[PDB]
Amino acid sequence: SNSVFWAEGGAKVQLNGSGLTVQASPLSRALKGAISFDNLSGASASQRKGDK
Amino acid sequence: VSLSAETLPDVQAGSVVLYRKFEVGEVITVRPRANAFDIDLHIKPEYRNLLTSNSVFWAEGGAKVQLNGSGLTVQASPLSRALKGAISFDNLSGASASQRKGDKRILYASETAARAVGGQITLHAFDAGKLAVGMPIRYLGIDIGQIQTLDLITARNEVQAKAVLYPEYVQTFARGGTRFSVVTPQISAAGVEHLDTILQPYINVEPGRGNPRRDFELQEATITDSRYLDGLSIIVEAPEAGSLGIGTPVLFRGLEVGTVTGMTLGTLSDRVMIAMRISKRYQHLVRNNSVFWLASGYSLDFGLTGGVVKTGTFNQFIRGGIAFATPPGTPLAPKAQEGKHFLLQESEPKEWREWGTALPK
Amino acid sequence: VEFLGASASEWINGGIRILPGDKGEMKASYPLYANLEKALENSLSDLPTTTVSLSAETLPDVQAGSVVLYRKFEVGEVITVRPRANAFDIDLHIKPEYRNLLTSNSVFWAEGGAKVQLNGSGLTVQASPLSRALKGAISFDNLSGASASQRKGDKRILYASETAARAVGGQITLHAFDAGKLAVGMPIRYLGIDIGQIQTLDLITARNEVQAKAVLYPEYVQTFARGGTRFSVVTPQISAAGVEHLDTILQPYINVEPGRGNPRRDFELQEATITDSRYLDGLSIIVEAPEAGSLGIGTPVLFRGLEVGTVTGMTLGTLSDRVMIAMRISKRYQHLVRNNSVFWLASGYSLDFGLTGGVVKTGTFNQFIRGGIAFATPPGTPLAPKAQEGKHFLLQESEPKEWREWGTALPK
């Protein structure tokens, strides 16, 4: 019941002090998209609000 | 091979397993557990002996970025390894504790995290804004430790940071009195001191002597020299602190021969005790009957008929130093011991330049 | 796109293709090669013959099948890499026509990796051969100092960088109180020309210092490392007065001041060093002062307001009653130095305010950044002899009143 969804995917090339990270590994994220989900403790209020 | 990882750092099914960047085995599968991921990997029977009980795994990957005189160079990994994946396994000396903890070997999300083995210490800090996960801990510019965990406490108004010190330096450090200081860039009109800390901050270490503690607190300033530590640490009692601080120079005839390790108050709050360390080569310059004064800023004398002012852009106008001298005398006083207390004179002696005391050795 | 072996008609026909030569004795038996490449190479086995053997503790993106290069030209190929007890043995094949391209004195380093370098010259992409970015490239060359590298170890050792491969010559050890400004591969320069390279950084738990191993090139090993040589890590100086060094933001180096004497090969890192090397031929005199004050390394020496020398160093004598400042004067101004010469310390701004007269003047002198030392000569018909190499003067506590009206005529 307590779960949150967000949209990842998009060809992401991040440059920082740690270096360069490319986030097009699965080869389908850069073409279609990726949606990542997880379970949180405060997601009960998000589930209650809205239709779904 | 079975590994556990809370997060998956670009592994996926079918990734390449490497022993110092050489194809040894392949990742069979990744299965999501209740709160982590269990990774099953296969290795060749001929290469089963390449790993032992003390082994560490980390996730490599795509590319490396180097900023230097030639510019910004992006050296990429080979295309096959970058596309399929890269998990590299090595053997360490401190990996025995990692093997003992947990059910079995645990996959690490970074090479630094995998290499972070050894003794464990806890640092209490009043602000974690300058702290970060994976922050290096250095003594004389050499990596000797790494911060691995940052935790905030609601009850006590402080941040507890867990750090791992390498087995080669765990015995030398963490012996009580050890000072850890987060170095910050100093860009001012006087000059620039630290500029690599813009991108790669670290924690400088000043070692101490005593019984092991393994529980320290983050300081604000620390002498990044470690050359006066072998010398005498004397105390100067002053009515007021003023411009003094950590790193304040100690001057014999205008030459920096020592530094100020720290400042504190005594049992009775009537004076400020400044602990300062002098160099070994200038140790014989310290005598029992030695006069100390505070040289801070610019001091000038203007008589009723004579106006003469002089400036010398001294470092005392950034950190007000303490100068010392010795009055002349045929019987020389014995050298000061390890613990010796002097009194800070309120004014510079008038004829200290004409003394010319001969100090042997 | 390569479609070799046989065409469509050649495949539907089948058989054995014949490549004629020029002359032969019609031997009884002939070998059957797998393809045209093996037929030309005269290799019966699939793998080529092993010609080059290398040892490497770590593998810097080599893998089996990497490209071997002679100044970025395809010469041979890496056959295989085998893991030993504590290292990796790399076997490589070279062509018989190109076997003469390498000799006893040769060095190998690892280039390959998809390198996109951005700088003022522009953008350079180093994935041209299309196999370097996938497998790897190993480049080899011939050096003069590679004889020591050949002697050390069992055989030739692959280097992880071109600078590491080129780092050959004499070996020196530098003791430093802080290695934060030191790094692996740090250049060591004299007058802006690369003459050495730092190769190893080691921390000592017993002695509170860092020992850095450096390699000096054979062309400069004899000239330097002769005792008294000063190595100083240059740092950027961004202040309100101005900016002096800005390439050290990205590429720091170690400036060298050479010395004269017996060879030492064991030095210590200093803090400041005169980066001029133009006063070194001149006289190095000593000035004794009651106090140091604003003096330091690089402090100017002024004759009538013109910089004619610098301060090489400061120290204390055998008896700790005065500060001895060693300063080097220029050759062209060497005759300006006399036995009866008066030296004074010009630091900051000095003004006189009488009981009835107030006149103050400022001149934004460099003495307000580095308090200089000025000198003059009192007038006299018999001129004193010129000062020798070792001459000691005394620093006057105050500027002479009428030094401007002297006007001493100094010949040459």
Alpha-carbon distance C293 to nearest alpha carbon in chain B (angstroms): 5
User: What do you get for the CA distance between the two ends of chain B, in Å?
Assistant: 66
DSSP code per residue over chain A: --EEEEE--S--EEEETTEEEE--TTSSTTTT--EEEEE-STHHHHHHSS--
B72: contact with C, CB 8 A cutoff: yes
A45: contact with B, CB 8 A cutoff: no
Do C239 and C232 form a contact (C-beta atoms < 8 A)? no
User: What do you get for the CA distance between the two ends of chain A, in Å?
Assistant: 10
C203:B142 CB<8 A? yes
| Alpha carbon distances (Å) from C179 to B200, B226, C233 | 15, 11, 10
Question: Of all helices (H) and strands (E), which one includes residue C311?
Answer: strand C306-316
* Token digits of residue C222: 């004899």
Q: Using DSSP, state whether C149 is helix, strand or coil.
A: helix
Alpha-carbon distance B329 to nearest alpha carbon in chain C (angstroms): 13
- C-alpha closest to that of B320 among B293, B301, B342: B293
B141:C180 CB<8 A? yes
A15: contact with B, CB 8 A cutoff: yes
C249: contact with B, CB 8 A cutoff: yes
Q: CB-based contacts of B278: which residues, under 8 Å, 6+ apart?
A: B228, B231, B232, B234, B250, B257, B258, B285, B286
Separation between Cα atoms, residue C386 and residue C384, nearest integer Å:
7
C186: left (phi over 0), alpha (psi -120 to 50) or beta: beta
Separation between Cα atoms, residue C174 and residue C255, nearest integer Å:
13
Q: How was this structure determined?
A: cryo-EM
**Resolution of the coordinates in A?**
3.5
CA Rg value for chain A: 15
Separation between Cα atoms, residue B76 and residue B61, nearest integer Å:
9
| Alpha carbon distances (Å) from C245 to B138, C51, C231, C251 | 26, 49, 17, 11
B312:C120 CB<8 A? no
Q: Partners of B300 in the beta sheet?
A: none
Separation between Cα atoms, residue B131 and residue B133, nearest integer Å:
7
Q: Using DSSP, state whether B214 is helix, strand or coil.
A: coil
Dihedral sign of CA atoms B169, B175, B179, B180 in order: positive
Residue recorded with tokens 């970074």: B110
Q: Partners of B149 in the beta sheet?
A: B162
C320:B172 CB<8 A? no
B23:C63 CB<8 A? yes
- 10 Å CB burial of residue C146 (0-12, 13-18, 19+) is buried
Q: Please state, as a whole number, how many other Cβ atoms lie within 10 Å of the Cβ of residue C409.
A: 8
Mutate one of A20, A27, A29 to test the B interface: name it (highest B CB count within 10 A): A20
Of B142, B311, B354, which is closest to C368 when you measure between CB atoms?
A: B311
Q: Please state, as a whole number, how many other Cβ atoms lie within 10 Å of the Cβ of residue C354.
A: 10
| Alpha carbon distances (Å) from B20 to B151, C225, C292 | 34, 38, 56
Angle CA(C88)–CA(C92)–CA(C98) in degrees, nearest 5? 150
Residue recorded with tokens 């699939």: C46
Of B195, B225, B311, which is closest to C348 when you measure between CB atoms?
A: B311
CA Rg value for chain B: 28
b/e C309-333 (16+ beta carbons within 10 angstroms → b):
bbbbbbebeeebbbbebebbbbeeb
C363: contact with B, CB 8 A cutoff: no
- 10 Å CB burial of residue B150 (0-12, 13-18, 19+) is middle
- Which residues in chain A have their CB less than 8 angstroms from residue B83's CB? 25, 27
C237: contact with B, CB 8 A cutoff: yes
B79: contact with A, CB 8 A cutoff: no
Q: CB-based contacts of C270: which residues, under 8 Å, 6+ apart?
A: C230, C231, C232
DSSP code per residue over B44-65: -STTGGG--SS-EEEE--SEEE
Do B63 and A22 form a contact (C-beta atoms < 8 A)? yes
Separation between Cα atoms, residue C187 and residue B175, nearest integer Å:
37
Do B227 and B279 form a contact (C-beta atoms < 8 A)? yes
Do B263 and B271 form a contact (C-beta atoms < 8 A)? no
| Alpha carbon distances (Å) from C221 to B174, B334, C157, C173, C281 | 43, 47, 23, 13, 21
Do B114 and B146 form a contact (C-beta atoms < 8 A)? no
B269: contact with A, CB 8 A cutoff: no
DSSP state of C349: -
Separation between Cα atoms, residue B349 and residue B291, nearest integer Å:
8
Q: Using DSSP, state whether B82 is helix, strand or coil.
A: helix
Q: What is the dihedral of CA B207, B210, B212, B213, to 10 degrees?
A: -80
Separation between Cα atoms, residue C245 and residue C162, nearest integer Å:
26
Give the amino acid at B221. A
Separation between Cα atoms, residue C107 and residue C165, nearest integer Å:
6
C250: contact with B, CB 8 A cutoff: yes
Separation between Cα atoms, residue C249 and residue C333, nearest integer Å:
36
Cα within 13 Å of Cα(C48), Cβ side: 21
Mutate one of A12, A14, A22 to test the B interface: name it (highest B CB count within 10 A): A22
CA-based max dimension of chain A: 43
C134:B80 CB<8 A? yes
Do B225 and C177 form a contact (C-beta atoms < 8 A)? yes
Residue recorded with tokens 């980390």: B58
C277: contact with B, CB 8 A cutoff: no
Residue recorded with tokens 């008929």: B305
| Alpha carbon distances (Å) from C258 to A6, B56, C204, C213 | 64, 47, 27, 18
Separation between Cα atoms, residue C20 and residue C7, nearest integer Å:
20
Do B192 and B228 form a contact (C-beta atoms < 8 A)? no
Separation between Cα atoms, residue C344 and residue C397, nearest integer Å:
7
DSSP state of B241: -
- C-alpha closest to that of B263 among B317, B299, B226, B223: B223
DSSP state of B23: E
Mutate one of A8, A18, A29, A41 to test the B interface: name it (highest B CB count within 10 A): A18
Residue C8 backbone phi and psi in degrees, to 5? -70, -45
CA-based max dimension of chain B: 98
Q: Using DSSP, state whether C229 is helix, strand or coil.
A: coil
Do C254 and C234 form a contact (C-beta atoms < 8 A)? yes
| Alpha carbon distances (Å) from C163 to B77, C108, C111, C136 | 20, 11, 11, 18
Separation between Cα atoms, residue B39 and residue B8, nearest integer Å:
10
A20: contact with B, CB 8 A cutoff: yes
Q: CB-based contacts of C5: which residues, under 8 Å, 6+ apart?
A: C35
* Token digits of residue C37: 């490449």
Separation between Cα atoms, residue C126 and residue C111, nearest integer Å:
10
Alpha-carbon distance C374 to nearest alpha carbon in chain B (angstroms): 15
* Token digits of residue C202: 């080691």
Residue C89 backbone phi and psi in degrees, to 5? -100, 120
Of A19, A25, A26, which is closest to B64 when you measure between CB atoms?
A: A19
Residue B99 backbone phi and psi in degrees, to 5? -65, -40
Alpha-carbon distance B23 to nearest alpha carbon in chain C (angstroms): 8
* Token digits of residue B354: 């004409």
- Distance from chain centroid for Cα C183: 12
Separation between Cα atoms, residue C111 and residue C74, nearest integer Å:
13
Give the amino acid at B304. L
Mutate one of B18, B20, B197 to test the C interface: name it (highest C CB count within 10 A): B20
b/e B229-251 (16+ beta carbons within 10 angstroms → b):
bebbbbebebeeeebbebbbbbb
Kindly give the residue spans of alpha helices, DSSP state H, lying in C202-297.
none
Dihedral sign of CA atoms B344, B248, B145, B163 in order: positive
Do B11 and B110 form a contact (C-beta atoms < 8 A)? no
- Which residues in chain B have their CB less than 8 angstroms from residue A21's CB? 61-62
- C-alpha closest to that of B278 among B300, B248, B305, B301: B248
Separation between Cα atoms, residue B292 and residue B322, nearest integer Å:
7
* Token digits of residue C46: 């699939």
Alpha-carbon distance B62 to nearest alpha carbon in chain A (angstroms): 7
Separation between Cα atoms, residue C12 and residue B344, nearest integer Å:
105
Kindly give the residue spans of alpha helices, DSSP state H, lying in C63-156.
146-151
Q: What is the dihedral of CA C29, C30, C31, C33, to 10 degrees?
A: -160
* Token digits of residue C260: 């004269």
Q: Helix, strand, coil shares of chain B as percentages rounded to 5?
A: 10, 40, 55
Residue recorded with tokens 């996938």: C134
Please report all neighbours of B, defined by 3+ CB atom pairs within 8 A. Answer: A, C
Sheet holding C114-119, edge to edge: B63-68, B71-76, C114-119, C122-125
B152: contact with C, CB 8 A cutoff: no
Do C212 and C185 form a contact (C-beta atoms < 8 A)? no
Question: Of all helices (H) and strands (E), which one includes residue B301?
Answer: strand B301-302
- Distance from chain centroid for Cα B54: 29
- Which residues in chain B have their CB less than 8 angstroms from residue A19's CB? 63-65
- Which residues in chain C have their CB less than 8 angstroms from residue B68's CB? 250-251
C321: contact with B, CB 8 A cutoff: yes
Separation between Cα atoms, residue C378 and residue B101, nearest integer Å:
83
- Which residues in chain B have their CB less than 8 angstroms from residue A28's CB? none
- 10 Å CB burial of residue B130 (0-12, 13-18, 19+) is middle
Of C88, C203, C352, which is closest to B140 when you measure between CB atoms?
A: C203
Q: Please state, as a whole number, how many other Cβ atoms lie within 10 Å of the Cβ of residue A22.
A: 16
* Token digits of residue C390: 């070792």
Do A11 and A31 form a contact (C-beta atoms < 8 A)? no
How many helices (H) and strands (E) in chain B?
3, 24
- C-alpha closest to that of B141 among C234, A51, C364, C183: C183
Separation between Cα atoms, residue A25 and residue B62, nearest integer Å:
9
Q: Partners of C314 in the beta sheet?
A: C325
- C-alpha closest to that of B130 among B246, B262, B220: B220
- C-alpha closest to that of C228 among C258, C191, C270, C266: C258
C115:B227 CB<8 A? no
Do C303 and C210 form a contact (C-beta atoms < 8 A)? no
- Residues comprising chain C, all counted: 412
DSSP state of C49: P
A4: contact with B, CB 8 A cutoff: no
CA-based max dimension of chain C: 124
Residue recorded with tokens 């001459």: C391
- Which residues in chain B have their CB less than 8 angstroms from residue A15's CB? 65
Q: Using DSSP, state whether C255 is helix, strand or coil.
A: strand
Residue C180 backbone phi and psi in degrees, to 5? -65, -35
Q: Where are the beta strands (DSSP E) in C61-106?
A: 67-70, 74-83, 88-93
Do B217 and B123 form a contact (C-beta atoms < 8 A)? yes
Q: Searching chain A, which residue's CA lies closest to the CA of residue B196? A: A17
Q: Using DSSP, state whether B329 is helix, strand or coil.
A: coil
Separation between Cα atoms, residue B300 and residue A42, nearest integer Å:
67
Question: Of all helices (H) and strands (E), which one includes residue B294?
Answer: strand B291-295
